[PDB]
Amino acid sequence: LAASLACAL
């Protein structure tokens, strides 16, 4: 989840 947020942004 954490990495997906960073990736998205």
Q: How far apart are CA 1 and CA 9, in angstroms?
A: 13
Declared resolution, Å? 1.0
Structural biology method used = X-ray
Compute the radius of gyration of the chain from its Cα atoms: 5
Phi/psi for 6 (5° steps) reads -60, -45
Q: How far apart are CA 1 and CA 8, in angstroms?
A: 11
- Tokens for 5? 């947020």
How far from the centroid of its chain's Cα atoms is residue 7's Cα? 4
DSSP per residue over 1-9, as a string? -HHHHHHH-
Q: How far apart are CA 5 and CA 3, in angstroms?
A: 5
